[PDB]
């Protein structure tokens, strides 16, 4: 196990769980995607183009909301494009990501 290792009782290593439900061609979804990509974070996109079932699954987790996109971090609901950009503008997004 050669290398410069970091020790702080992590045990098994996980990182921020970031999810975004999208339509690929939605300009608001695209805008939210761009922000996340710029940050360089690892995340999961659920592109649900024309997928009615997945939308109902999304709405179940997002306060019944069916608007796109819907964003989650560590299983907490962040909201849509405006929401994440508002958090970033007030310096609240990076420590959720989480740095």
Tab-separated table of N, CA and C in Angstrom:
chain	number	residue	atom	x	y	z
A	1	UNK	N	0.819	-1.207	0.000
A	1	UNK	CA	0.000	0.000	0.000
A	1	UNK	C	0.856	1.262	0.000
A	2	UNK	N	1.784	1.331	-0.949
A	2	UNK	CA	2.647	2.491	-1.113
A	2	UNK	C	1.812	3.713	-1.481
A	3	UNK	N	2.149	4.865	-0.908
A	3	UNK	CA	1.470	6.101	-1.249
A	3	UNK	C	1.306	7.043	-0.077
A	4	UNK	N	0.887	8.269	-0.372
A	4	UNK	CA	0.620	9.254	0.669
A	4	UNK	C	-0.842	9.145	1.082
A	5	UNK	N	-1.090	8.470	2.200
A	5	UNK	CA	-2.459	8.176	2.612
A	5	UNK	C	-2.997	9.160	3.646
A	6	UNK	N	-4.284	9.471	3.530
A	6	UNK	CA	-4.941	10.346	4.486
A	6	UNK	C	-5.670	9.525	5.538
A	7	UNK	N	-5.407	9.823	6.806
A	7	UNK	CA	-6.069	9.120	7.894
A	7	UNK	C	-6.985	10.045	8.678
A	8	UNK	N	-8.277	9.732	8.692
A	8	UNK	CA	-9.191	10.343	9.653
A	8	UNK	C	-10.452	9.520	9.896
A	9	UNK	N	-10.264	8.225	10.139
A	9	UNK	CA	-11.323	7.359	10.653
A	9	UNK	C	-12.540	7.261	9.737
A	10	UNK	N	-12.347	7.584	8.463
A	10	UNK	CA	-13.395	7.427	7.461
A	10	UNK	C	-13.921	5.994	7.416
A	11	UNK	N	-13.042	5.034	7.683
A	11	UNK	CA	-13.359	3.641	7.439
A	11	UNK	C	-13.531	3.459	5.944
A	12	UNK	N	-14.720	3.039	5.518
A	12	UNK	CA	-15.015	2.989	4.091
A	12	UNK	C	-15.279	4.393	3.556
A	13	UNK	N	-14.739	4.672	2.376
A	13	UNK	CA	-14.739	6.021	1.836
A	13	UNK	C	-15.946	6.299	0.949
A	14	UNK	N	-16.805	7.205	1.403
A	14	UNK	CA	-17.838	7.764	0.540
A	14	UNK	C	-17.668	9.266	0.390
A	15	UNK	N	-18.383	9.831	-0.573
A	15	UNK	CA	-18.342	11.258	-0.839
A	15	UNK	C	-19.772	11.745	-0.985
A	16	UNK	N	-19.940	13.035	-1.249
A	16	UNK	CA	-21.272	13.599	-1.433
A	16	UNK	C	-22.040	12.868	-2.527
A	17	UNK	N	-23.272	12.486	-2.210
A	17	UNK	CA	-24.157	11.841	-3.169
A	17	UNK	C	-24.990	12.917	-3.858
A	18	UNK	N	-24.681	13.181	-5.121
A	18	UNK	CA	-25.334	14.257	-5.859
A	18	UNK	C	-26.150	13.695	-7.020
A	19	UNK	N	-27.435	14.033	-7.050
A	19	UNK	CA	-28.335	13.548	-8.087
A	19	UNK	C	-29.060	14.709	-8.747
A	20	UNK	N	-29.258	14.613	-10.056
A	20	UNK	CA	-30.054	15.608	-10.756
A	20	UNK	C	-30.964	14.932	-11.776
A	21	UNK	N	-32.268	15.146	-11.628
A	21	UNK	CA	-33.235	14.625	-12.585
A	21	UNK	C	-33.373	15.649	-13.704
A	22	UNK	N	-33.265	15.208	-14.955
A	22	UNK	CA	-33.267	16.148	-16.075
A	22	UNK	C	-34.066	15.688	-17.282
A	23	UNK	N	-34.369	16.645	-18.154
A	23	UNK	CA	-34.553	16.358	-19.568
A	23	UNK	C	-33.322	16.933	-20.250
A	24	UNK	N	-32.724	16.165	-21.152
A	24	UNK	CA	-31.434	16.531	-21.730
A	24	UNK	C	-31.465	17.867	-22.459
A	25	UNK	N	-32.620	18.208	-23.014
A	25	UNK	CA	-32.736	19.402	-23.842
A	25	UNK	C	-33.465	20.539	-23.139
A	26	UNK	N	-33.716	20.365	-21.845
A	26	UNK	CA	-34.313	21.426	-21.048
A	26	UNK	C	-33.244	22.459	-20.717
A	27	UNK	N	-33.471	23.722	-21.104
A	27	UNK	CA	-32.438	24.753	-20.943
A	27	UNK	C	-32.119	25.039	-19.480
A	28	UNK	N	-33.084	24.807	-18.594
A	28	UNK	CA	-32.872	25.005	-17.167
A	28	UNK	C	-32.094	23.823	-16.592
A	29	UNK	N	-32.405	22.623	-17.078
A	29	UNK	CA	-31.661	21.424	-16.702
A	29	UNK	C	-30.225	21.541	-17.187
A	30	UNK	N	-30.070	22.010	-18.423
A	30	UNK	CA	-28.754	22.204	-19.024
A	30	UNK	C	-27.937	23.225	-18.247
A	31	UNK	N	-28.597	24.275	-17.770
A	31	UNK	CA	-27.922	25.320	-17.006
A	31	UNK	C	-27.435	24.782	-15.665
A	32	UNK	N	-28.260	23.963	-15.023
A	32	UNK	CA	-27.898	23.356	-13.747
A	32	UNK	C	-26.754	22.362	-13.922
A	33	UNK	N	-26.814	21.582	-15.000
A	33	UNK	CA	-25.750	20.643	-15.338
A	33	UNK	C	-24.411	21.350	-15.503
A	34	UNK	N	-24.437	22.516	-16.143
A	34	UNK	CA	-23.218	23.272	-16.414
A	34	UNK	C	-22.531	23.693	-15.123
A	35	UNK	N	-23.322	24.148	-14.154
A	35	UNK	CA	-22.780	24.565	-12.866
A	35	UNK	C	-22.075	23.408	-12.166
A	36	UNK	N	-22.739	22.255	-12.127
A	36	UNK	CA	-22.193	21.059	-11.488
A	36	UNK	C	-20.918	20.575	-12.178
A	37	UNK	N	-20.886	20.673	-13.505
A	37	UNK	CA	-19.709	20.273	-14.278
A	37	UNK	C	-18.531	21.203	-14.015
A	38	UNK	N	-18.815	22.500	-13.910
A	38	UNK	CA	-17.783	23.500	-13.642
A	38	UNK	C	-17.121	23.267	-12.289
A	39	UNK	N	-17.905	22.804	-11.318
A	39	UNK	CA	-17.405	22.535	-9.973
A	39	UNK	C	-16.429	21.362	-9.971
A	40	UNK	N	-16.593	20.456	-10.931
A	40	UNK	CA	-15.717	19.304	-11.047
A	40	UNK	C	-16.150	18.156	-10.159
A	41	UNK	N	-17.357	18.258	-9.610
A	41	UNK	CA	-17.876	17.216	-8.734
A	41	UNK	C	-18.363	15.999	-9.513
A	42	UNK	N	-18.330	14.851	-8.846
A	42	UNK	CA	-18.868	13.612	-9.382
A	42	UNK	C	-20.343	13.534	-9.028
A	43	UNK	N	-21.185	13.250	-10.015
A	43	UNK	CA	-22.617	13.185	-9.751
A	43	UNK	C	-23.378	12.272	-10.706
A	44	UNK	N	-24.622	11.978	-10.345
A	44	UNK	CA	-25.463	11.104	-11.146
A	44	UNK	C	-26.614	11.887	-11.772
A	45	UNK	N	-26.724	11.819	-13.095
A	45	UNK	CA	-27.846	12.437	-13.787
A	45	UNK	C	-28.880	11.384	-14.144
A	46	UNK	N	-30.120	11.617	-13.731
A	46	UNK	CA	-31.224	10.780	-14.167
A	46	UNK	C	-31.952	11.497	-15.289
A	47	UNK	N	-31.441	11.354	-16.508
A	47	UNK	CA	-32.115	11.911	-17.672
A	47	UNK	C	-33.365	11.090	-17.952
A	48	UNK	N	-34.526	11.713	-17.790
A	48	UNK	CA	-35.790	10.991	-17.863
A	48	UNK	C	-36.692	11.436	-19.019
A	49	UNK	N	-36.069	11.789	-20.145
A	49	UNK	CA	-36.786	12.168	-21.363
A	49	UNK	C	-37.948	11.233	-21.689
A	50	UNK	N	-39.156	11.787	-21.720
A	50	UNK	CA	-40.340	11.019	-22.062
A	50	UNK	C	-40.695	9.896	-21.102
A	51	UNK	N	-39.950	9.777	-20.004
A	51	UNK	CA	-40.175	8.708	-19.035
A	51	UNK	C	-41.148	9.156	-17.946
A	52	UNK	N	-42.415	8.806	-18.121
A	52	UNK	CA	-43.466	9.218	-17.204
A	52	UNK	C	-43.346	8.594	-15.815
A	53	UNK	N	-42.948	7.325	-15.759
A	53	UNK	CA	-42.794	6.619	-14.486
A	53	UNK	C	-41.727	7.264	-13.614
A	54	UNK	N	-40.577	7.540	-14.216
A	54	UNK	CA	-39.451	8.115	-13.494
A	54	UNK	C	-39.796	9.501	-12.956
A	55	UNK	N	-40.641	10.222	-13.688
A	55	UNK	CA	-41.104	11.536	-13.252
A	55	UNK	C	-41.932	11.423	-11.978
A	56	UNK	N	-42.762	10.389	-11.903
A	56	UNK	CA	-43.578	10.162	-10.719
A	56	UNK	C	-42.698	9.771	-9.547
A	57	UNK	N	-41.593	9.097	-9.852
A	57	UNK	CA	-40.628	8.703	-8.835
A	57	UNK	C	-39.887	9.930	-8.343
A	58	UNK	N	-39.589	10.832	-9.272
A	58	UNK	CA	-38.952	12.093	-8.937
A	58	UNK	C	-39.857	12.916	-8.034
A	59	UNK	N	-41.112	13.066	-8.450
A	59	UNK	CA	-42.091	13.869	-7.722
A	59	UNK	C	-42.316	13.357	-6.302
A	60	UNK	N	-42.174	12.050	-6.115
A	60	UNK	CA	-42.333	11.448	-4.793
A	60	UNK	C	-41.250	11.936	-3.826
A	61	UNK	N	-40.055	12.190	-4.355
A	61	UNK	CA	-38.926	12.639	-3.540
A	61	UNK	C	-38.806	14.161	-3.462
A	62	UNK	N	-39.445	14.861	-4.392
A	62	UNK	CA	-39.284	16.311	-4.492
A	62	UNK	C	-40.543	17.093	-4.118
A	63	UNK	N	-41.110	16.800	-2.948
A	63	UNK	CA	-42.287	17.512	-2.447
A	63	UNK	C	-43.458	17.570	-3.434
A	64	UNK	N	-43.605	16.527	-4.247
A	64	UNK	CA	-44.682	16.461	-5.220
A	64	UNK	C	-44.410	17.264	-6.479
A	65	UNK	N	-43.301	18.001	-6.483
A	65	UNK	CA	-42.961	18.866	-7.610
A	65	UNK	C	-42.543	18.060	-8.834
A	66	UNK	N	-43.063	18.441	-9.998
A	66	UNK	CA	-42.720	17.755	-11.243
A	66	UNK	C	-41.917	18.628	-12.192
A	67	UNK	N	-41.525	19.805	-11.724
A	67	UNK	CA	-40.737	20.716	-12.545
A	67	UNK	C	-39.306	20.198	-12.695
A	68	UNK	N	-38.640	20.607	-13.771
A	68	UNK	CA	-37.282	20.154	-14.064
A	68	UNK	C	-36.295	21.321	-14.041
A	69	UNK	N	-35.075	21.086	-13.529
A	69	UNK	CA	-34.585	19.840	-12.930
A	69	UNK	C	-34.945	19.719	-11.452
A	70	UNK	N	-34.709	18.543	-10.878
A	70	UNK	CA	-34.790	18.363	-9.434
A	70	UNK	C	-33.458	17.839	-8.915
A	71	UNK	N	-32.909	18.528	-7.922
A	71	UNK	CA	-31.550	18.256	-7.467
A	71	UNK	C	-31.516	17.804	-6.007
A	72	UNK	N	-30.663	16.823	-5.716
A	72	UNK	CA	-30.535	16.272	-4.370
A	72	UNK	C	-29.063	16.138	-3.984
A	73	UNK	N	-28.753	16.409	-2.719
A	73	UNK	CA	-27.400	16.235	-2.199
A	73	UNK	C	-27.464	15.542	-0.847
A	74	UNK	N	-26.848	14.364	-0.757
A	74	UNK	CA	-26.919	13.540	0.446
A	74	UNK	C	-28.371	13.313	0.858
A	75	UNK	N	-29.212	13.040	-0.139
A	75	UNK	CA	-30.624	12.713	0.061
A	75	UNK	C	-31.485	13.867	0.592
A	76	UNK	N	-30.922	15.073	0.637
A	76	UNK	CA	-31.696	16.272	0.963
A	76	UNK	C	-32.096	16.993	-0.324
A	77	UNK	N	-33.349	17.436	-0.396
A	77	UNK	CA	-33.860	18.092	-1.600
A	77	UNK	C	-33.371	19.534	-1.713
A	78	UNK	N	-32.642	19.822	-2.788
A	78	UNK	CA	-32.113	21.157	-3.040
A	78	UNK	C	-33.095	21.989	-3.865
A	79	UNK	N	-33.684	21.361	-4.877
A	79	UNK	CA	-34.654	22.032	-5.719
A	79	UNK	C	-34.217	22.115	-7.165
A	80	UNK	N	-34.640	23.180	-7.841
A	80	UNK	CA	-34.379	23.343	-9.259
A	80	UNK	C	-33.154	24.170	-9.601
A	81	UNK	N	-33.102	24.634	-10.847
A	81	UNK	CA	-31.968	25.403	-11.353
A	81	UNK	C	-31.766	26.712	-10.594
A	82	UNK	N	-32.846	27.469	-10.413
A	82	UNK	CA	-32.782	28.733	-9.684
A	82	UNK	C	-32.274	28.527	-8.262
A	83	UNK	N	-32.722	27.436	-7.649
A	83	UNK	CA	-32.381	27.105	-6.271
A	83	UNK	C	-30.886	26.865	-6.063
A	84	UNK	N	-30.285	26.051	-6.927
A	84	UNK	CA	-28.866	25.734	-6.795
A	84	UNK	C	-27.987	26.944	-7.124
A	85	UNK	N	-28.431	27.766	-8.071
A	85	UNK	CA	-27.686	28.964	-8.448
A	85	UNK	C	-27.794	30.041	-7.375
A	86	UNK	N	-28.912	30.050	-6.660
A	86	UNK	CA	-29.093	30.968	-5.541
A	86	UNK	C	-28.175	30.571	-4.390
A	87	UNK	N	-28.086	29.269	-4.124
A	87	UNK	CA	-27.195	28.763	-3.088
A	87	UNK	C	-25.745	29.100	-3.416
A	88	UNK	N	-25.379	28.951	-4.683
A	88	UNK	CA	-24.012	29.215	-5.112
A	88	UNK	C	-23.666	30.697	-5.026
A	89	UNK	N	-24.639	31.549	-5.339
A	89	UNK	CA	-24.442	32.989	-5.301
A	89	UNK	C	-24.275	33.530	-3.895
A	90	UNK	N	-24.774	32.796	-2.908
A	90	UNK	CA	-24.647	33.228	-1.523
A	90	UNK	C	-23.553	32.441	-0.804
A	91	UNK	N	-22.813	31.635	-1.561
A	91	UNK	CA	-21.682	30.897	-1.014
A	91	UNK	C	-22.068	29.693	-0.172
A	92	UNK	N	-23.262	29.158	-0.415
A	92	UNK	CA	-23.788	28.040	0.363
A	92	UNK	C	-23.673	26.683	-0.337
A	93	UNK	N	-23.294	26.673	-1.611
A	93	UNK	CA	-23.312	25.426	-2.379
A	93	UNK	C	-22.077	24.558	-2.154
A	94	UNK	N	-20.901	25.172	-2.209
A	94	UNK	CA	-19.647	24.442	-2.036
A	94	UNK	C	-19.563	23.577	-0.765
A	95	UNK	N	-19.965	24.113	0.404
A	95	UNK	CA	-19.889	23.254	1.594
A	95	UNK	C	-20.929	22.130	1.623
A	96	UNK	N	-21.872	22.120	0.683
A	96	UNK	CA	-22.814	21.008	0.558
A	96	UNK	C	-22.196	19.913	-0.306
A	97	UNK	N	-21.290	20.329	-1.188
A	97	UNK	CA	-20.752	19.477	-2.257
A	97	UNK	C	-19.687	18.356	-2.023
A	98	UNK	N	-18.877	18.359	-0.955
A	98	UNK	CA	-18.916	19.327	0.134
A	98	UNK	C	-17.600	20.053	0.436
A	99	UNK	N	-17.152	20.859	-0.533
A	99	UNK	CA	-16.095	21.878	-0.402
A	99	UNK	C	-15.578	22.271	-1.782
